[PDB]
Amino acid sequence: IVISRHVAIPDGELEITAIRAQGAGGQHVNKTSTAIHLRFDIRASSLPEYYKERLLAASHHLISSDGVI
Amino acid sequence: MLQPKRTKFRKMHKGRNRGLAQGTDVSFGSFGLKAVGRGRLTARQIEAARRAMTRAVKRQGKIWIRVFPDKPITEKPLAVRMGKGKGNVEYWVALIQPGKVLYEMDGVPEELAREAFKLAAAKLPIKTTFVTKTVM
Amino acid sequence: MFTINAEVRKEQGKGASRRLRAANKFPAIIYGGKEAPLAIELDHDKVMNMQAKAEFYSEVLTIVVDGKEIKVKAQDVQRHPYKPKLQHIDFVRA
Amino acid sequence: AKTIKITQTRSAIGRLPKHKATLLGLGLRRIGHTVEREDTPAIRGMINAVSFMVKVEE
Amino acid sequence: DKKSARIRRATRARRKLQELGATRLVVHRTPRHIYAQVIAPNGSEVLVAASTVEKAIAEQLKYTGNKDAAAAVGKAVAERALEKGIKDVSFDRSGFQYHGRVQALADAAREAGLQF
């Protein structure tokens, strides 16, 4: 929701879905959607430049090649 | 954010909200916003109403908040079982009975009075009206 | 000098007074002095109009009961909590 | 002296134990059952206690 | 002060006597003219009160307000009590320390019939 003392996330630019986890767990991890899958567009979010720019000028495994985290 | 500076106990019972109200007649200002309904006013609500009210008028006028939350309402964290003790204080509310004058105001023409009080009552979960100070 | 008609409260108490206030009247009590205070029922719309004037309480009033006329000053009034209504008034004789 | 005739008009089923005992202290057993009792203040109070399920013809 | 201090000193034993229900003999010393009384358990009426302030005991003494005058008063209340049939009483210091004039009165009355 917040990063620095100045920039923050209004949650109106951050969609989350509840999907299933992996690995062990029994008949629970099968049905129950307990893992979180978070998507966050940067190109079209209320973030400053030098944040949008600095993300899109990076190579992190969380950042998709389409400017979405 | 109104709050009891150094209360006595942290958590208190839910209780009830039966009866009519006591802060009923306009005491301080020329006019006021009586509560026709019944319920609770979170500190966030009182703050938003006071801001929506003190901005509709400029720094002109004077406003009295005849309500103060002084009741800690607790909620359990998300995804917990029942039991294991009472929750944790998360906000403070003032129980409002029909008749409690929530905001008094003076120093502005009744035009600004009614307008600001409508702008404020838009931010409250409880029916309100507009009352004038009465005599005898 | 506001003239106010009236009637003696036939039966008194909470239930009767609530029936009264539902009948578009309301009670009031004239006391002050040595005579027994007079329990009065009296119309609501007239009186709620009268009290709207800033003179209703500063001046004197002529309560009419069985032809009798009483000069009184409204000492104390029980208003409704949130409705523009009156529940009761203390009319002090003289 | 003067007696008074009392009937039952409602069921004593969903009634409080005080009212069960009061109907017993009147002598009423059924709905429509009628009895005759001395008209004493104790009896008149015993009636206005269950005034909702007893009909009186003084 | 002085008066209420002594009175609260007395209140304890006064109330204890009022509890025990005894016909209590009371003493009120005073820089002059020591007084004495005898009051029934209900405490609203006395039976014997022989104090120096009576002119029968006035002249017969040098100074009302010495242990000797107190002894005369004690003998006087004792005689009047044995006249009133009161054999025994319970002494009341009334806050006064049972040392000087009050002790003189008490010893006198004790030797003069009253079984307190």
Next chain:
Amino acid sequence: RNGRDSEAKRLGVKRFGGESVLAGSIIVRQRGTKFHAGANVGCGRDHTLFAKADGKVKFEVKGPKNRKFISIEAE
């Protein structure tokens, strides 16, 4: 934390006014001298008021402090 308590003591007024008693029969159990020892009524170390004569209880407001006393009238 919380969760503790103590078994209730069963204090109170075991005998009320106008209530015949025997000698020594307890009348009031209490902590303080909320009710004070009147005539024919004792006061145990528990501040328990008990009877000192077979009579009838009586509550009064004797005294300048209005403290309530409990007498027993052998009626």
Next chain:
RNA sequence: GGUUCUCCCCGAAAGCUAUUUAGGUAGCGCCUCGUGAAUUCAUCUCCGGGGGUAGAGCACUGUUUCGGCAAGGGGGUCAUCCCGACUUACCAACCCGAUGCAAACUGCGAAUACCGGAGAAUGUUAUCACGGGAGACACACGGCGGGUGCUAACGUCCGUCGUGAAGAGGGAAACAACCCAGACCGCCAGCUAAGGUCCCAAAGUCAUGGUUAAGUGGGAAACGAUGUGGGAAGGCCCAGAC
């Protein structure tokens, strides 16, 4: 898990306390059988009782707003040296006035309930004691007072009442616990309760006034609107208004 012929009579509990105890058991509470005994018991009225709950209040414990106030504080008028004057442009204790709030606040304080006494009526002794026999200690919903929970739950845990359990019949379409109501048996007899009366489907297309235009009736909030019925006043206006 199962436990086998019949009728009649009474008929519970799912609570407390303790338990390597929690789904078992033991005493007691509740049922039954026998005996004994007292207005012994209940209800109503009166009389004597103690409370500190609801409500209220803010003297107390805190808490809260506004204002007046001001010891002090801290600046300069100060060097106007033992000492105090002013001001503070300001900072404010205490106190006062006006406004609320409290399960763990109370100088106030019910209704009820409970205890005790007396008085009649009624109750198949309705009561207590002992003895034979138990069962039961998994309770549920509804109302009322609550904690907890989210002033969520057919949630949970308490107090109290009712019901189901262990009670059928009528109503709520259907619907253990809601409303009416307690089934000994038979009747092709009647009056009623809740609930109903156009047809399914027994009973009013009932009578008098009203309202609703929505199929509202026959799901729902903030809020919004010349919807329409009413009431009370007003403003301007035949010195002719809108």
Next chain:
RNA sequence: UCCUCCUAAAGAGUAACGGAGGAGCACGAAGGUUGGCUAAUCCUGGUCGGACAUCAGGAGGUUAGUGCAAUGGCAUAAGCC
């Protein structure tokens, strides 16, 4: 396990993995009894000495204390000698 308040619905009782605290002792004087005494705070003075010791007066009126928690008491003091 025991104690105190509240929940607990003005008799008793009353549950929660409900809300707030405590104890597993101390004392031959901290008990008995007799006698005596009366607090906290603030103000004004007054050697350091200050906001705050001690001294005095005043206001106050028990807002102190109660060997240790809370409640209930406690001026006849249960408080201090």
Next chain:
RNA sequence: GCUCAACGGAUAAAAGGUACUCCGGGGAUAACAGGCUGAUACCGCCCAAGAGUUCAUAUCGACGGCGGUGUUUGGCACCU
């Protein structure tokens, strides 16, 4: 003479694993699913500070509020 304190104390004296497992029971009680609820989730609406060159309502909407759905994770443990 016992922190027999698990404090009505079962012995003077006793810790674990089991996915190699077994038996007796339970939906009295969990995992899945259905259920009641709707915190959470999602969706809509009210207010309008502001942003929108000026202009709140093209578009967006602070501080706050009112609901709907029953897609999530929960809650309860009602069915198995």
Next chain:
RNA sequence: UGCCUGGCGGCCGUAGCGCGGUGGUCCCACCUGACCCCAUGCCGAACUCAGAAGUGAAACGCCGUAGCGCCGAUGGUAGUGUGGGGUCUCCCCAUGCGAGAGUAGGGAACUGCCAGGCAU
């Protein structure tokens, strides 16, 4: 019989506090003195003793005084038992009980026994 005073009470603020006034024949109080009876955790302050020289100044009693304190109606409201109903975490209706606060006002205590002084 009237007043004043002292003791012991009933009663516990309609009785207390304040403000103004007044009292010394008796009483009471202050007071004088203290080797002593006794006394201080130092002090004849207090307690105690031996007396009254002096004063009602303080104290206390009494009178007036509402400035508080206190008491306190009548109605109305709140709450509530029982029955019923709703638009139901809140109410309404029929009935019974009915406050609290506040208001009008009241309010400068009343009183028994004994003893003394004075009037008589």
